[PDB]
Amino acid sequence: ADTIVAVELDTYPNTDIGDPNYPHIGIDIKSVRSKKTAKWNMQNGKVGTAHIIYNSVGKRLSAVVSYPNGDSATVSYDVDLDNVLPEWVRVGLSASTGLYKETNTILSWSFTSKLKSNETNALHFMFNQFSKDQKDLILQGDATTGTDGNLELTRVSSNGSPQGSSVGRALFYAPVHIWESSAVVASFDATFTFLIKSPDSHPADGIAFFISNIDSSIPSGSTGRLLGLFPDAN
Amino acid sequence: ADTIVAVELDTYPNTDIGDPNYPHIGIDIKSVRSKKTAKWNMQNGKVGTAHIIYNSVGKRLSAVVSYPNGDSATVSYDVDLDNVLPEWVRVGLSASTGLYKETNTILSWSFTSKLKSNSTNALHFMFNQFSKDQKDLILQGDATTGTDGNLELTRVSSNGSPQGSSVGRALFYAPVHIWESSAVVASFDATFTFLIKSPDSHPADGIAFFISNIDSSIPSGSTGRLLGLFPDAN
Amino acid sequence: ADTIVAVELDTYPNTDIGDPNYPHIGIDIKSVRSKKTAKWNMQNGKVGTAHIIYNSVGKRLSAVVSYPNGDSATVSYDVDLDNVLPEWVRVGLSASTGLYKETNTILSWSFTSKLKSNSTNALHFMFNQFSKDQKDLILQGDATTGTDGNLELTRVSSNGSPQGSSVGRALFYAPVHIWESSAVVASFDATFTFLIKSPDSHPADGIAFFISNIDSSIPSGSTGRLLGLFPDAN
Amino acid sequence: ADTIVAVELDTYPNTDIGDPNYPHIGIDIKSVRSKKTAKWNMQNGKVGTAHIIYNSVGKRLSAVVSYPNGDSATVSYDVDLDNVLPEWVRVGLSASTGLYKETNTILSWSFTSKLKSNETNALHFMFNQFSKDQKDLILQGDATTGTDGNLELTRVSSNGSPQGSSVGRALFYAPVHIWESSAVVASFDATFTFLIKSPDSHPADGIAFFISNIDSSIPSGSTGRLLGLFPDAN
Numbered sequence: 025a026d027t028i029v030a031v032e033l034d035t036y037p038n039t040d041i042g043d044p045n046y047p048h049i050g051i052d053i054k055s056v057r058s059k060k061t062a063k064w065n066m067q068n069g070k071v072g073t074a075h076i077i078y079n080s081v082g083k084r085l086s087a088v089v090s091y092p093n094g095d096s097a098t099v100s101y102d103v104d105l106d107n108v109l110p111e112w113v114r115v116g117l118s119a120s121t122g123l124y125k126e127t128n129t130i131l132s133w134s135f136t137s138k139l140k141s142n143e144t145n146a147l148h149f150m151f152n153q154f155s156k157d158q159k160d161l162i163l164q165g166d167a168t169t170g171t172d173g174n175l176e177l178t179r180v181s182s183n184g185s186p187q188g189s190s191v192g193r194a195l196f197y198a199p200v201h202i203w204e205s206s207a208v209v210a211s212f213d214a215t216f217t218f219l220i221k222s223p224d225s226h227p228a229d230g231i232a233f234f235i236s237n238i239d240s241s242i243p244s245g246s247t248g249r250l251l252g253l254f255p256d257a258n
Numbered sequence: 259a260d261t262i263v264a265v266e267l268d269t270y271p272n273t274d275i276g277d278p279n280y281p282h283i284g285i286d287i288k289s290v291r292s293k294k295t296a297k298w299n300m301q302n303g304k305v306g307t308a309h310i311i312y313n314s315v316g317k318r319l320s321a322v323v324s325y326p327n328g329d330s331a332t333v334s335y336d337v338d339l340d341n342v343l344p345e346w347v348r349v350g351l352s353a354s355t356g357l358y359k360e361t362n363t364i365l366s367w368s369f370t371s372k373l374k375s376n377s378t379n380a381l382h383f384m385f386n387q388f389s390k391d392q393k394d395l396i397l398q399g400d401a402t403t404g405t406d407g408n409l410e411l412t413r414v415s416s417n418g419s420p421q422g423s424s425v426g427r428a429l430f431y432a433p434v435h436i437w438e439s440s441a442v443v444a445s446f447d448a449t450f451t452f453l454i455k456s457p458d459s460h461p462a463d464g465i466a467f468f469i470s471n472i473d474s475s476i477p478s479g480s481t482g483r484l485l486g487l488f489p490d491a492n
Numbered sequence: 493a494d495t496i497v498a499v500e501l502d503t504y505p506n507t508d509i510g511d512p513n514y515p516h517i518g519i520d521i522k523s524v525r526s527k528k529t530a531k532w533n534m535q536n537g538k539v540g541t542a543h544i545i546y547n548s549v550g551k552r553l554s555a556v557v558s559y560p561n562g563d564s565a566t567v568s569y570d571v572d573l574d575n576v577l578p579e580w581v582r583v584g585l586s587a588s589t590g591l592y593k594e595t596n597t598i599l600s601w602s603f604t605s606k607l608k609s610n611s612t613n614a615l616h617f618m619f620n621q622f623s624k625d626q627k628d629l630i631l632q633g634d635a636t637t638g639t640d641g642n643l644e645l646t647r648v649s650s651n652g653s654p655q656g657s658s659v660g661r662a663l664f665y666a667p668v669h670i671w672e673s674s675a676v677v678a679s680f681d682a683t684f685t686f687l688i689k690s691p692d693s694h695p696a697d698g699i700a701f702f703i704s705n706i707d708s709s710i711p712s713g714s715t716g717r718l719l720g721l722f723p724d725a726n
Numbered sequence: 727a728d729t730i731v732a733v734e735l736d737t738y739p740n741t742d743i744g745d746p747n748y749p750h751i752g753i754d755i756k757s758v759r760s761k762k763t764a765k766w767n768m769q770n771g772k773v774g775t776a777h778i779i780y781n782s783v784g785k786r787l788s789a790v791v792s793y794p795n796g797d798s799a800t801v802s803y804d805v806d807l808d809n810v811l812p813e814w815v816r817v818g819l820s821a822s823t824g825l826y827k828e829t830n831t832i833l834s835w836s837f838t839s840k841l842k843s844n845e846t847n848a849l850h851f852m853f854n855q856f857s858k859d860q861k862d863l864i865l866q867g868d869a870t871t872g873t874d875g876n877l878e879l880t881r882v883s884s885n886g887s888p889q890g891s892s893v894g895r896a897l898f899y900a901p902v903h904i905w906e907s908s909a910v911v912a913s914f915d916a917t918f919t920f921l922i923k924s925p926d927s928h929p930a931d932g933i934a935f936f937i938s939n940i941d942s943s944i945p946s947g948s949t950g951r952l953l954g955l956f957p958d959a960n
């Protein structure tokens with residue numbers, strides 16, 4: 025199957041597959057079952073920012089998700105991505121809804137990858153606006169691009185209303201050389217801003233930044249808790 | 259045909275199609291017939307650096323090609339690329355050889371594009387090493403990468419000898435949103451380092467940084483003086 | 493006297509010293525009388541963005557001022573800053589009021605200078621928030637920072653009314669190496685956002701991004717039309 | 727006393743003050759006795775690169791030192807710099823010699839600090855060439871800027887012989903806002919390349935990248951094992 029590294033913003037506690045019992049940020053290493061999570065107070069209708077940092081030297085992948093009021097959740101996990109990911113990846117954003125739903129609107133997304141040495145290859149991109157025809161994004165599933173200049177990872181009605189049973193991803197068009205055996209530093213960071221809104225009995229299921237093999241597609245049966253990322257909950 | 263914007267480092271004077279009567283740098287707007295050129299002292303077997311800058315605000319596309327000894331050639335041309343390129347492009351490097359030849363070796367290539375509203379979309383990439391399998395490059399024609407870490411735009415026979423009638427291009431894999439209706443600034447810059455060596459009677463034909471439609475292909479019969487860029491010399 | 497290169501967002505037409513008879517953006521080289529201006533529709537109480545770009549290849553000092561509604565004014569002047577500016581400079585933002593006044597509120601300020609040859613010396617700074625004690629800014633005259641996170645270049649009264657006869661500047665703390673003899677490309681760009689509000693008839697006098705000798709000081713009497721930049725209107 | 731956070735490339739084992747008995751990279755928090763070290767194979771006369779990474783999410787101060795042959799040593803220490811450093815700092819490079827000596831030649835140095843949110847303040851500087859009058863560097867002690875275009879932190883004799891009992895530092899001219907209470911991510915990276923040569927088969931004492939109070943100066947008697955950083959070996 026695909027190889028996945030993700031930072032999930034998991035709005036829906038699927039405790040029966042190992043979620044903690046609250047919305048959480050988590051770090052997923054080849055499994056929807058986060059290796060580390062932190063409780064996350066998802067702020068309905070508020071614009072959140074998720075910052076993801078992989079420090080290749082410290083071998084530590086960290087994430088924070090914050091809201092303008094300063095409330096944040098952080099998670100770090102010690103991992104050497106050289107041992108996890110293929111050298112070449114796509115990077116992307118994934119979201120899903122299930123029986124419960126929420127908007128999984130991306131308002132901005134940037135990524136920087138650097139491979140040093142022995143000089144530097146780098147890739148940076150920044151989206152503060154997404155066009156109707158956002159040619160440098162591979163949209164998968166229900167993901168669509170704006171207006172309102174946004175990336176809507178999952179189905180939302182034109183009049184704002186999240187759809188259940190939706191899964192969508194957007195991967196940057198170019199493959200990213202995420203590590204190299206001879207790379208002294210293979211670091212990357214990503215940030216995205218998001219607006220998760222639910223009228224629902226509960227928001228679900230979340231948004232993930234993910235890093236996948238280049239040919240990654242939405243696994244069959246990965247709406248809901250899986251979060252467009254994984255074929256199963258193992 | 260394709261829509262081409264290029265900075266050519268034209269090593270071979272094809273005076274019958276309007277080249278000046280010397281190696282030159284030129285700015286090509288939809289035609290191999292440079293809109294502006296500057297005499298360029300190509301330094302055989304030395305590593306040169308081409309810096310290309312497009313100032314969206316000043317509407318000026320500028321290039322300098324320099325060598326470590328300080329010798330440089332400069333060309334500017336006033337142009338509004340909004341009126342020239344499609345909104346979405348690929349960027350790349352092209353080189354060709356004809357009846358005469360040269361190595362068209364790219365040692366590094368970086369590109370930065372920014373679309374500014376007040377919010378910014380940006381793309382930056384940097385290649386200081388090219389891998390044998392450089393997945394974020396579209397190699398066209400004779401272009402190859404590695405394992406010496408270089409991008410060889412045209413055929414070079416392994417003991418280092420350039421091949422005649424060779425054309426090759428490397429385009430960045432992702433499409434580039436190079437201008438937008440709504441962009442107050444749609445600037446970009448590109449840098450590449452190159453090694454043109456010719457054992458010959460003359461080097462030919464040159465290297466170009468180019469910006470083309472996304473689906474740009476080497477036009478048929480564009481080895482030689484057409485630099486892998488144009489179908490004809492109009 | 494200081495050496496001043498400035499981009500002025502001149503809100504008040506001082507036609508007696510060669511302002512055109514409208515608000516304008518201007519390129520100033522060692523005179524407050526801009527070498528080039530463009531008519532500027534200043535939008536009272538709206539956040540404008542000024543982008544300023546220069547490189548030593550094109551040698552075109554360009555500036556655009558835009559507002560979110562999409563109105564922009566652009567001015568460019570070819571000028572070889574090697575022959576104007578000292579090698580080392582400070583960069584800054586300056587504003588003034590005279591008989592008439594306006595808030596000259598700076599909301600953000602970014603600047604990048606680069607000196608390139610082989611593959612670079614660079615400086616980049618970005619302020620999206622100014623601190624009450626912004627230790628990397630030299631505030632001169634009436635300029636103040638914080639706690640609203642803004643830089644107020646000129647005097648704003650407690651009731652929000654801007655004051656007349658005010659001048660203030662902020663320069664980045666470090667000297668900037670703006671050109672270097674052996675640099676193949678010396679480039680800078682600057683971006684700032686500003687909020688010019690004038691409760692009535694008329695806003696004055698303007699805001700400028702400037703580059704000056706490192707010890708640059710507000711010239712005495714440089715309120716008003718001298719924009720905190722020039723000792724006189726010559 | 728100054729507050730010092732440093733990454734030391736310690737060439738000389740001072741086992742009497744708790745160095746391990748081999749050249750090492752160390753993370754130093756308010757003591758010369760590194761909180762963490764890794765064994766470092768210092769390659770005399772080869773150009774090394776140190777990369778130093780920290781962000782306030784992962785709070786892992788990481789450093790790698792590498793050489794072009796691909797030998798590297800890495801050290802990381804989780805430390806909450808919010809609780810160590812003043813909010814504003816200067817950043818610098820320091821080196822020393824004592825009884826034994828080495829050139830402590832800096833060939834490049836770059837640095838980026840960013841404070842996100844809710845947007846970004848950033849500082850970036852890069853020196854690949856140092857100048858004789860490098861106005862954006864505060865040189866302390868024996869530190870000199872060339873040509874050769876290098877920063878020589880410690881005294882090197884006319885005949886190229888490094889001198890003993892030398893200490894010198896270069897700090898970037900502007901204060902750096904290293905953390906901020908409301909910032910979701912405060913990050914810094916530093917890289918420098920260095921050339922440590924000892925004719926005397928006995929190199930000492932090392933080079934450090936350091937972050938200190940803005941008024942940091944070379945502690946008296948901080949030659950030798952104190953690396954120009956600490957007043958004592960506590």
Ligand SMILES: CO[C@@H]1O[C@H](CO)[C@@H](O[C@H]2O[C@H](CO)[C@@H](O)[C@H](O)[C@@H]2O)[C@H](O)[C@@H]1O
Nearest residue numbers: 036038121122123124125228229247248249
């Ligand atoms: C065993 O009963 C299950 O109940 C849950 C929730 O009622 C449901 O989960 C679905 O919706 C959630 C939230 O969107 C997702 O996390 C799941 O993948 C799934 O789609 C099950 O379907 C069952 O009814």
Ligand SMILES: CO[C@@H]1O[C@H](CO)[C@@H](O[C@H]2O[C@H](CO)[C@@H](O)[C@H](O)[C@@H]2O)[C@H](O)[C@@H]1O
Nearest residue numbers: 270272355356357358359462463481482483
């Ligand atoms: C009419 O005679 C032509 O002369 C030139 C050169 O002798 C030749 O051009 C070919 O080679 C050059 C140099 O590589 C290229 O610029 C051209 O495109 C072409 O391939 C013509 O073929 C004829 O000989």
Ligand SMILES: CO[C@@H]1O[C@H](CO)[C@@H](O[C@H]2O[C@H](CO)[C@@H](O)[C@H](O)[C@@H]2O)[C@H](O)[C@@H]1O
Nearest residue numbers: 504506589590591592696697715716717718
């Ligand atoms: C002519 O005497 C003055 O009247 C002018 C206005 O014409 C005034 O100018 C001051 O204010 C303007 C607008 O703010 C500035 O551009 C000038 O530099 C100056 O400050 C004079 O001060 C007298 O009142």
Ligand SMILES: CO[C@@H]1O[C@H](CO)[C@@H](O[C@H]2O[C@H](CO)[C@@H](O)[C@H](O)[C@@H]2O)[C@H](O)[C@@H]1O
Nearest residue numbers: 738740823824825826930931949950951952
């Ligand atoms: C013990 O008396 C000293 O001998 C030591 C060497 O053990 C010497 O130390 C100096 O040199 C080392 C290596 O350069 C530094 O690490 C020390 O700080 C110091 O400068 C003493 O000075 C005496 O010679």
Ligand SMILES: [Ca+2]
Nearest residue numbers: 034036037038
């Ligand atoms: Ca879940």
Ligand SMILES: [Ca+2]
Nearest residue numbers: 268270271272
């Ligand atoms: Ca030609």
Ligand SMILES: [Ca+2]
Nearest residue numbers: 502504505506
């Ligand atoms: Ca005026």
Ligand SMILES: [Ca+2]
Nearest residue numbers: 736738740951
């Ligand atoms: Ca020691």
Ligand SMILES: [Mn+2]
Nearest residue numbers: 034043050058
């Ligand atoms: Mn989860």
Ligand SMILES: [Mn+2]
Nearest residue numbers: 268277284292
């Ligand atoms: Mn030509």
Ligand SMILES: [Mn+2]
Nearest residue numbers: 502511518526
């Ligand atoms: Mn004016």
Ligand SMILES: [Mn+2]
Nearest residue numbers: 736745752760
């Ligand atoms: Mn030590």
